[PDB]
Design an enzyme around this catalytic site. Structure first.
Site, PDB file in Angstrom:
ATOM      1  N   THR A 215       1.449 -11.197   3.312  1.00 17.97           N
ATOM      2  CA  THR A 215       0.381 -11.687   4.072  1.00 17.97           C
ATOM      3  C   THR A 215      -0.622 -12.693   3.301  1.00 17.97           C
ATOM      4  OG1 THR A 215       0.419  -9.485   4.794  1.00 17.97           O
ATOM      5  CG2 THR A 215      -1.613 -10.534   5.333  1.00 17.97           C
ATOM      6  N   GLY A 216      -1.055 -12.551   2.190  1.00 17.69           N
ATOM      7  CA  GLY A 216      -1.715 -13.562   1.371  1.00 17.69           C
ATOM      8  C   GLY A 216      -1.057 -14.869   1.417  1.00 17.69           C
TER       9      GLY A 216
ATOM     10  N   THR B  39       3.277  -6.353  -8.182  1.00 17.02           N
ATOM     11  CA  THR B  39       4.039  -4.974  -7.693  1.00 17.02           C
ATOM     12  C   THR B  39       5.284  -5.694  -6.728  1.00 17.02           C
ATOM     13  OG1 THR B  39       3.149  -3.152  -7.059  1.00 17.02           O
ATOM     14  CG2 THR B  39       2.750  -4.675  -5.263  1.00 17.02           C
TER      15      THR B  39
ATOM     16  N   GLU C 180       7.387 -13.057  -5.814  1.00 18.28           N
ATOM     17  CA  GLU C 180       6.181 -13.857  -5.766  1.00 18.28           C
ATOM     18  C   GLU C 180       6.040 -15.158  -6.138  1.00 18.28           C
ATOM     19  OE1 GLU C 180       2.967  -9.749  -6.312  1.00 18.28           O
ATOM     20  OE2 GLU C 180       3.154 -11.477  -7.805  1.00 18.28           O
TER      21      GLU C 180
ATOM     22  N   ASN D 251      -4.102 -13.896 -12.746  1.00 21.17           N
ATOM     23  CA  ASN D 251      -4.472 -12.379 -12.841  1.00 21.17           C
ATOM     24  C   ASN D 251      -4.120 -12.273 -14.646  1.00 21.17           C
ATOM     25  OD1 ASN D 251      -5.661 -11.255 -10.766  1.00 21.17           O
ATOM     26  ND2 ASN D 251      -3.744 -10.511 -10.157  1.00 21.17           N
TER      27      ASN D 251
ATOM     28  N   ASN E 144     -11.554  -7.554 -10.260  1.00 18.75           N
ATOM     29  CA  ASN E 144     -12.289  -8.015  -9.184  1.00 18.75           C
ATOM     30  C   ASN E 144     -13.699  -8.026  -9.286  1.00 18.75           C
ATOM     31  OD1 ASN E 144      -9.725  -8.317  -7.901  1.00 18.75           O
ATOM     32  ND2 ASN E 144      -9.948  -6.346  -6.505  1.00 18.75           N
TER      33      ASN E 144
ATOM     34  N   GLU F 117     -19.441 -31.510  -1.009  1.00 20.55           N
ATOM     35  CA  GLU F 117     -19.783 -31.968  -2.382  1.00 20.55           C
ATOM     36  C   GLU F 117     -18.777 -31.589  -3.476  1.00 20.55           C
ATOM     37  OE1 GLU F 117     -24.016 -32.173  -3.016  1.00 20.55           O
ATOM     38  OE2 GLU F 117     -23.958 -32.539  -4.945  1.00 20.55           O
TER      39      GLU F 117
HETATM   40  N1  LIG Z   1      -7.118  -9.715  -8.623  1.00 23.40           N
HETATM   41  C1  LIG Z   1      -6.453  -9.056  -7.644  1.00 23.40           C
HETATM   42  N2  LIG Z   1      -5.009  -9.195  -7.400  1.00 23.40           N
HETATM   43  C2  LIG Z   1      -4.510  -8.477  -6.551  1.00 23.40           C
HETATM   44  C3  LIG Z   1      -5.192  -7.470  -5.793  1.00 23.40           C
HETATM   45  N3  LIG Z   1      -4.177  -6.848  -5.248  1.00 23.40           N
HETATM   46  C4  LIG Z   1      -3.041  -7.290  -5.265  1.00 23.40           C
HETATM   47  N4  LIG Z   1      -3.248  -8.491  -6.064  1.00 23.40           N
HETATM   48  C5  LIG Z   1      -2.309  -9.173  -6.639  1.00 23.40           C
HETATM   49  O1  LIG Z   1      -1.716 -10.085  -5.740  1.00 23.40           O
HETATM   50  C6  LIG Z   1      -0.249 -10.002  -5.537  1.00 23.40           C
HETATM   51  C7  LIG Z   1       0.039  -9.412  -4.315  1.00 23.40           C
HETATM   52  O2  LIG Z   1      -0.602  -9.608  -3.132  1.00 23.40           O
HETATM   53  P1  LIG Z   1      -1.144  -8.821  -2.031  1.00 23.40           P
HETATM   54  O3  LIG Z   1      -2.305  -9.324  -1.380  1.00 23.40           O
HETATM   55  O4  LIG Z   1      -1.094  -7.145  -2.618  1.00 23.40           O
HETATM   56  O5  LIG Z   1      -0.021  -8.783  -0.857  1.00 23.40           O
HETATM   57  P2  LIG Z   1      -0.777  -8.980   0.828  1.00 23.40           P
HETATM   58  O6  LIG Z   1      -1.381 -10.176   0.904  1.00 23.40           O
HETATM   59  O7  LIG Z   1      -1.396  -7.412   0.954  1.00 23.40           O
HETATM   60  O8  LIG Z   1       0.767  -9.016   1.561  1.00 23.40           O
HETATM   61  P3  LIG Z   1       1.853  -7.853   2.057  1.00 23.40           P
HETATM   62  O9  LIG Z   1       1.505  -6.472   1.310  1.00 23.40           O
HETATM   63  O10 LIG Z   1       3.127  -8.617   1.368  1.00 23.40           O
HETATM   64  O11 LIG Z   1       1.831  -7.527   3.389  1.00 23.40           O
HETATM   65  C8  LIG Z   1       0.041  -9.910  -6.978  1.00 23.40           C
HETATM   66  O12 LIG Z   1       0.138 -10.815  -7.658  1.00 23.40           O
HETATM   67  C9  LIG Z   1      -1.011  -8.501  -7.481  1.00 23.40           C
HETATM   68  O13 LIG Z   1      -1.300  -8.356  -8.888  1.00 23.40           O
HETATM   69  C10 LIG Z   1      -6.744  -7.064  -6.246  1.00 23.40           C
HETATM   70  O14 LIG Z   1      -7.281  -6.488  -5.710  1.00 23.40           O
HETATM   71  N5  LIG Z   1      -7.052  -8.023  -7.181  1.00 23.40           N
HETATM   72  C1  LIG Z   2      11.383  -4.760  -8.811  1.00 17.96           C
HETATM   73  O1  LIG Z   2      11.576  -3.366  -8.499  1.00 17.96           O
HETATM   74  C2  LIG Z   2      10.686  -2.996  -7.555  1.00 17.96           C
HETATM   75  C3  LIG Z   2       9.501  -3.614  -6.768  1.00 17.96           C
HETATM   76  C4  LIG Z   2       8.796  -3.251  -5.858  1.00 17.96           C
HETATM   77  C5  LIG Z   2       9.192  -2.135  -5.030  1.00 17.96           C
HETATM   78  C6  LIG Z   2       8.371  -1.433  -4.154  1.00 17.96           C
HETATM   79  N1  LIG Z   2       7.965  -0.244  -4.151  1.00 17.96           N
HETATM   80  C7  LIG Z   2       8.152   0.691  -5.588  1.00 17.96           C
HETATM   81  C8  LIG Z   2       8.692   1.931  -5.672  1.00 17.96           C
HETATM   82  C9  LIG Z   2       9.298   2.749  -4.559  1.00 17.96           C
HETATM   83  C10 LIG Z   2       9.326   2.094  -3.238  1.00 17.96           C
HETATM   84  C11 LIG Z   2       9.937   2.923  -2.214  1.00 17.96           C
HETATM   85  C12 LIG Z   2      10.503   4.389  -2.491  1.00 17.96           C
HETATM   86  C13 LIG Z   2      10.399   4.717  -3.642  1.00 17.96           C
HETATM   87  C14 LIG Z   2       9.935   4.092  -4.622  1.00 17.96           C
HETATM   88  O2  LIG Z   2      10.051   4.654  -6.110  1.00 17.96           O
HETATM   89  N2  LIG Z   2       8.663   2.321  -6.799  1.00 17.96           N
HETATM   90  C15 LIG Z   2       7.965   1.691  -7.425  1.00 17.96           C
HETATM   91  C16 LIG Z   2       7.671   1.325  -9.007  1.00 17.96           C
HETATM   92  C17 LIG Z   2       6.999   0.335  -9.205  1.00 17.96           C
HETATM   93  C18 LIG Z   2       6.461  -0.595  -8.405  1.00 17.96           C
HETATM   94  F1  LIG Z   2       5.590  -1.936  -8.636  1.00 17.96           F
HETATM   95  C19 LIG Z   2       6.957  -0.443  -7.058  1.00 17.96           C
HETATM   96  N3  LIG Z   2       7.573   0.505  -6.824  1.00 17.96           N
HETATM   97  C20 LIG Z   2      10.318  -1.321  -5.824  1.00 17.96           C
HETATM   98  C21 LIG Z   2      11.162  -1.883  -6.869  1.00 17.96           C
END
Ligand SMILES: Nc1nc2c(ncn2[C@@H]2O[C@H](COP(=O)(O)OP(=O)(O)OP(=O)(O)O)[C@@H](O)[C@H]2O)c(=O)[nH]1
Ligand SMILES: COc1ccc(CNc2c(-c3ccccc3O)nc3ccc(F)cn23)cc1
Ligand SMILES: Nc1ncnc2c1ncn2[C@@H]1O[C@H](COP(=O)(O)OP(=O)(O)CP(=O)(O)O)[C@@H](O)[C@H]1O
Ligand SMILES: Nc1nc2c(ncn2[C@@H]2O[C@H](COP(=O)(O)OP(=O)(O)O)[C@@H](O)[C@H]2O)c(=O)[nH]1
Ligand SMILES: [Ca+2]
Ligand SMILES: [Ca+2]
Ligand SMILES: [Mg+2]
Ligand SMILES: [Mg+2]
Lengths: 424, 437, 53, 309
Positions: free
Chosen positions: B145-146, B179, B183, B206, B228, B254
């Protein structure tokens, strides 16, 4: 995205699926009749993912129980938590499937599938935002294997945009109902490669060895194997069932775990292995979950390379120590993780531990060493198929030898494809 | 005065907006219900703070903010939370299904179905403005989304409001807190599609912020709350000149004129000092010389990189607290003789200073200590291309194998847009190298 | 070191110091959003044709 | 169990540092495009300094100081000396040098031209020191190792790279007698093996022939020039308080004139060591540069001088 719809098919499908509902119902504070007698609000916050709320604040598993014979499903209703399942979702035939894939997929099961899909559609409709389906089944018999993969194909037709998960129990001569298992499994793997986003490969070979070697059970029953299965299933669903920063869903898992669409066969792992008093330190959990001895698929991860990893720690522990230890195995065994997916290991922590243990770790790995599993089944298959042995059971239900040849070829291709990324 | 609309997209954008708007309310003396005792023109005004807040006849002060997430859980925490009455329900927009960390799902699939709802709610705020300047957009490079939905919004904002400035606040992805594995794909994709539509963009790595939190706040394992709250102090430093009486960076045009001579090269490095723990019992308060000098340490930058091996095109010192011109010049004099501050031949080697006497506000029961004086340096250095090269390498690595590409294509996108986006970045890195050597 | 353009007010002050001198349209956009819905919808038709077989 | 990567295949020095590291038990080597290393043993051209120190859980060290090229390219070294106040235009130990782009004898370099008619042009040292019996030119090569803390470690064994043809005033084109490089010669080894005189020998020669020592007549001035050149660029290259750390080995080349005055000719960013001195030098690199950063289960002089004024 919250609601998942669970389907359990056949003897194995319903045996392990019953244990899953036993395990997670205890974790969410639900009792044998359906009432909530918990204590933490965190237990109910995403109870909606797997349970429906009913008249009188009863919680009813969003679970469809499927078999071609009533043997196993009368046992499920008899057993400890049976009275919780919605009785309309018990959908069963009479004649069974005789460990024959063809009967499940093409004849007996075809007769029954449209009724299962009416219950699926019933549960699917009263869902705020369905993320997908998970199926529990074995690949070695006829109902959970053949019928199960028939369902999957139908569900994909009606819901082509939702996620499909399997917990798929792979067979072994070490725990063996019949000589035709490799046939049934090879016919189902061909289906799973095309029609699922994620498959947890629970190898019965690996469960037998964990039971024998590491747990000192000389004569392991299916109960002993299913103890290991329901703890793994508990672990790989934790992130969906609890909070609180990881907005973890089945699609996100599929996107991050599966770099190439056919390579979605996950090796699960659990630590500590049980059937204790001393809680494990985070270093020990981290050594154990990554150990070959602790894998639910009989594959040496040193023979392959990890494409992606997802690790889930349960209990109260230092997240500082969890990162340190998770970074230590990566830095100290970096050859075994592919350089061309940076940061392929993602780790999460959840404060609620499982019943019994103060702290635990669950591992989810898309390793290329999974090929060894498909190679093992490909070999058992060929031993027989080169003399067309046992084929009359399948050709009598209208199947052709060409269909076996096709299936043998898809799996051997899968194996080639996994072998391709081990050397890149 | 001329009004500014803040747009918060995705989890990162939304949670960071929360943190900013909390801080903004404390800074101006506005309270969780929206009442501002110190405001005497009830029902309207053209004061500096009205650039960010509108007013109702009842006396409520209302952000010129729009929060947008494709899933409801994070925006639900704003709806049910401490500043719930502050916002109007139509400002807070949610879907049912997130982008699943996929740029193309957020941009093309789920994007398409919601872009017209969002632009309509933006117009509802734009039509309360006597002279809109433009937009501050908050988002992650890495979220689906972001990244994905932001870039479609930026495309449309240019069509619908072509004369207005657009500033980005962007979270660059960090493996420590990340997560998702894709990315790098999301970040290059959005950076390419947004580059021509953004006028000035402030990256926040970050990694940098997380290490600032470990090192200077003694936080064992930084949450998003920690990161944050620190980021909002930086954001607040940058936007203060839009919200307060002064004569530097008084409008969005500016920022572009002071910080961005060459328009593709519009990523200024923020540096910030001092960051001091509220649990420190004894703290010796730092002076102007000490904190101006802290702005040339890499350890205080929002992105880790080495300005010594690069060139500046602009620098801007924004002081907060007890500071006077002659202390700044004396500090600038000292610092010039020690450090390597090579500018480009076509730009004047100089500093535009801005001082506001009101010292930084800190959230009560927060992590940051109150200080007598703080500063945020905004420098456009070529050293920030280090951040692009890293992100580009990680993309090259995965993309050589076509890894994960199928998820994007499956949402309608074309394998071609990957190399197209990556060629723009290849060119972007080459622009920085020309100017820099 | 020359300290030019000095402006003061009651909430702050600002100055410069110098050490040494020297867009696609709404058609194009709604178009290529829809071309990705074409290809999305082709992909899904090929799936349902394969499933029909 | 520390890890490293190798990215210059030509480094004779860091081929040996690589070998010494493996034969320990505590250092594993990786493939060149793995990010997860403690130590980079990097490349001469385009070393990606902006990718180091961004791997959580690893401390990262590299065997080059980013920016140190400003001392090692000839054109920039001339520019650094003329422009830096701490080694001014009136710098007594650097040959008068000028830059224009593509007793009054000069040399031109970056094919070499020694003449008065005709990159950098540099004054030619018309009356250099000559070793007897022989009547012949030489240059001194000192090896210096700057660690992660910016300690400047001079290596006690230098080497004279001798000429083996009598030096000639009237005849400038003959390169074997004017240019004393180890390559250009191969009387290659008449007076000493491979045209190399080490310090114990050159000291005795000075003692016997000139009534002085190498320490007093030559080495004090060498130590002053090394310390002056590196302290000059320290602010521009130090990695103290930085997210990755650097060490580097440099080779300083000197000329001694007839009245025993040392002149800096050139600084070298990727020097090779002399055949005998590998083991002792490459071990000391591991001791001082690497194992100081990554401890396990002297041969240098340290250059420091805080005179109060
Ligand atoms: N500094 C900061 N980074 C964040 C936060 N939430 C997520 N991130 C970072 O932003 C990235 C993930 O983007 P998100 O904003 O969670 O994704 P989203 O825009 O919600 O989009 P989807 O979940 O893909 O629909 C990663 O690099 C995270 O560490 C926050 O509250 N603060
Ligand atoms: C590269 O590996 C991954 C990256 C993102 C995800 C999505 N969600 C998820 C999950 C997860 C998602 C669905 C069902 C069971 C699960 O245990 N477990 C984790 C642990 C850590 C993390 F950062 C995300 N996780 C999964 C794997
Ligand atoms: N101004 C000068 N006066 C006297 N001799 C000079 C000189 N400049 C250069 N030389 C001689 O020329 C030879 C080679 O020149 P220079 O040392 O500049 O290049 P180089 O690249 O071969 C050294 P290295 O490769 O070891 O760093 C040296 O042996 C030196 O004695
Ligand atoms: N782990 C495990 N494996 C089982 C269980 N029940 C059967 N199996 C295995 O499943 C395969 C036979 O499939 P089964 O489910 O009985 O057949 P179906 O009812 O026709 O689907 C063989 O490989 C058995 O070893 C069980 O409860 N646990
Ligand atoms: Ca029948
Ligand atoms: Ca007012
Ligand atoms: Mg059976
Ligand atoms: Mg989200």
């Amino acid at each position: 995205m919250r609601e998942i719809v669970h389907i359990q098919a056949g003897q194995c499908g319903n045996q392990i699926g019953a244990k899953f509902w036993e395990v997670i119902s205890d974790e969410h504070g639900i009792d044998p009749t359906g009432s909530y007698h918990g204590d933490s609000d965190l237990q109910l916050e995403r109870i909606n993912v797997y349970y429906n709320e009913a008249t009188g604040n009863k919680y009813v598993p969003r679970a469809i129980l499927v078999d071609l014979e009533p043997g196993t499903m009368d046992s499920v209703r008899s057993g400890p938590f049976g009275q919780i399942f919605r009785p309309d979702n018990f959908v069963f035939g009479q004649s069974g499937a005789g460990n024959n894939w063809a009967k499940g997929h093409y004849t007996e099961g075809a007769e029954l599938v449209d009724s299962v899909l009416d219950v699926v559609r019933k549960e699917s409709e009263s869902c705020d935002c369905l993320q997908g389906f998970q199926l529990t089944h074995s690949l070695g018999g006829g109902t959970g294997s053949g019928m199960g993969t028939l369902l999957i194909s139908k569900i994909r037709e009606e819901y082509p945009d939702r996620i499909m998960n399997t917990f798929s129990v792979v067979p072994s001569p070490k725990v063996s109902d019949t000589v035709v298992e490799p046939y049934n499994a090879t016919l189902s793997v061909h289906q799973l490669v095309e029609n699922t986003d994620e498959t947890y490969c629970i190898d019965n070979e690996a469960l037998y060895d964990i039971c024998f070697r590491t747990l000192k059970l000389t004569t392991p029953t299916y109960g002993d194997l299913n103890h290991l299965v329901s703890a793994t299933m508990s672990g790989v669903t934790t992130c969906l069932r609890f909070p609180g920063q990881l907005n973890a869903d089945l699609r996100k898992l599929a996107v991050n775990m599966v770099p190439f669409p056919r390579l979605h066969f996950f090796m699960p792992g659990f630590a500590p292995l049980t059937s204790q008093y001393r809680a494990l330190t985070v270093p020990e959990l981290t050594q154990q979950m990554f150990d070959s001895k602790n894998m639910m698929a009989a594959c040496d991860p040193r023979h392959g390379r990890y494409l992606t990893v997802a690790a889930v720690f349960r209990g109260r522990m230092s997240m500082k120590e969890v990162d340190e230890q998770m970074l230590n195995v990566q830095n100290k065994n970096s050859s075994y993780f592919v350089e061309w997916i940076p940061n392929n290991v993602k780790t999460a922590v959840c404060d609620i531990p499982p019943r019994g243990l103060k702290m635990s770790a669950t591992f989810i790995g898309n390793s290329t060493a999974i090929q060894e599993l498909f190679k093992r089944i490909s070999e058992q298959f060929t031993a027989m198929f080169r003399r067309k042995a046992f084929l009359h059971w399948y050709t009598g239900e209208g199947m052709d030898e060409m269909e076996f040849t096709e299936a043998e070829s898809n799996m051997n291709d899968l194996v080639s494809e996994y072998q391709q990324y081990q050397d890149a | 005065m001329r009004e500014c609309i803040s747009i918060h997209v995705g989890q990162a954008g939304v949670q960071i907006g929360n943190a900013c708007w909390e801080l903004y309310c404390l800074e101006h003396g506005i309270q969780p219900d929206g009442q501002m005792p110190s405001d005497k023109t009830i029902g309207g005004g053209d004061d500096s703070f009205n650039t960010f807040f509108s007013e109702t006849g009842a006396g409520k002060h209302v952000p010129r903010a729009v929060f947008v997430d494709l899933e409801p859980t994070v925006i639900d925490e704003v709806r049910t939370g401490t500043y719930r009455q502050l916002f109007h329900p139509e400002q807070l927009i949610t879907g049912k299904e997130d982008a699943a960390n996929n740029y193309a799902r957020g941009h093309y699939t789920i994007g398409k179905e919601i872009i017209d709802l969002v632009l309509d709610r933006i117009r509802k705020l734009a039509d309360q403005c006597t002279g809109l300047q433009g937009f501050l957009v908050f988002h992650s490079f890495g979220g689906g989304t972001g990244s994905g939905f932001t870039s479609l919004l930026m495309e449309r904002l240019s069509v619908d409001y072509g004369k207005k400035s657009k500033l980005e606040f962007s979270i660059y992805p960090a493996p420590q807190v990340s997560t998702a594995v894709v990315e790098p794909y999301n970040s290059i994709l959005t950076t390419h599609t947004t580059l021509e539509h953004s006028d000035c963009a402030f990256m926040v790595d970050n990694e940098a912020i997380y290490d600032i939190c470990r090192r200077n706040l003694d936080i064992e394992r930084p949450t998003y709350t920690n990161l944050n709250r620190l980021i909002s102090q930086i954001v607040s430093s940058i936007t203060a000149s839009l919200r307060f009486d002064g004569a530097l960076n008084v409008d969005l045009t500016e920022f572009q004129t002071n910080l961005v001579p060459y328009p593709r090269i519009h990523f200024p490095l923020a540096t910030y000092a001092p960051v001091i723990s509220a649990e420190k019992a004894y703290h010796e308060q730092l002076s102007v010389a000490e904190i101006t000098n802290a702005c040339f340490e890499p350890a205080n930058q929002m992105v880790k990189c080495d300005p010594r091996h690069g060139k500046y095109m602009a620098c801007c010192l924004l002081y907060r607290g007890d500071v006077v011109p002659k202390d700044v010049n004396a500090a600038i004099a000292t610092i010039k003789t020690k450090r390597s501050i090579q500018f480009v031949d076509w730009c004047p080697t100089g500093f535009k200073v801005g001082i506001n006497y009101q010292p930084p506000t800190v959230v009560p029961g927060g992590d940051l200590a109150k200080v007598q004086r703080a500063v945020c340096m905004l420098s456009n250095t070529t050293a920030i291309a280090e951040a692009w090269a890293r992100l580009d390498h990680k993309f090259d690595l995965m993309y050589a194998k076509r890894a994960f590409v199928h998820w994007y294509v499956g949402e309608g996108m074309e394998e071609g847009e990957f190399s197209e986006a990556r060629e723009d970045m290849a060119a972007l890195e080459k622009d920085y190298e020309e100017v820099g050597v | 070191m020359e300290v030019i353009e000095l402006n003061k007010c009651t909430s702050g002050q600002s100055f410069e110091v110098i050490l040494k001198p020297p867009d696609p349209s709404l058609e194009e956009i709604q178009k290529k959003l829809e071309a990705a819905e074409e290809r999305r919808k082709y992909q899904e038709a090929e799936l349902l044709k394969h499933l029909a077989e | 169990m520390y890890t490293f990567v190798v990215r210059d295949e030509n480094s004779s020095v860091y081929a040996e540092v690589s070998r010494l590291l493996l034969a320990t038990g505590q250092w594993k080597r990786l493939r060149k495009d793995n990010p997860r290393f403690n130590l980079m043993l990097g490349e001469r051209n385009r070393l990606p300094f902006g990718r180091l120190g961004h791997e959580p859980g690893l401390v990262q060290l590299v065997n080059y100081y980013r920016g140190a090229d400003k001392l090692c390219r000839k054109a920039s070294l001339v520019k650094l000396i003329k422009t830096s106040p701490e080694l001014s235009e009136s710098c007594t130990w650097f040959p008068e040098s000028y830059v224009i782009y593509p007793g009054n004898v000069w040399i031109a370099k970056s094919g070499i031209l020694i003449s008065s008619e005709a990159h950098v042009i540099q004054k030619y040292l018309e009356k250099p020191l000559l070793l007897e019996p022989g009547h012949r030119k030489f240059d001194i090569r000192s090896w210096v190792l700057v660690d992660h803390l910016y300690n400047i470690y001079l290596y006690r064994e230098g080497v004279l790279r001798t000429s083996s043809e009598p030096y000639n005033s009237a005849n400038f084109q003959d390169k074997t007698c004017h240019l004393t490089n180890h390559c250009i010669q191969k009387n290659y080894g008449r007076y000493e093996e491979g045209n190399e005189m080490f310090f114990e020998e050159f000291n005795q020669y000075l003692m016997d022939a000139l009534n002085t020592t190498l320490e007093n007549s030559i080495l004090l001035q060498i130590k002053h020039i090394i310390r002056s050149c590196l302290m000059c660029i320290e602010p521009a290259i130090s990695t103290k308080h930085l997210h990755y750390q650097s060490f580097q080995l440099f080779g300083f080349d000197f000329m001694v004139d007839e009245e025993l005055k040392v002149w800096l000719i050139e600084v070298n960013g990727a020097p090779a060591c002399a055949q005998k001195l590998y083991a002792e030098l490459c071990q000391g690199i591991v001791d001082v540069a690497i194992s100081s950063v990554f401890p396990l289960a002297s041969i240098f002089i340290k250059l420091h001088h805080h005179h109060h004024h």
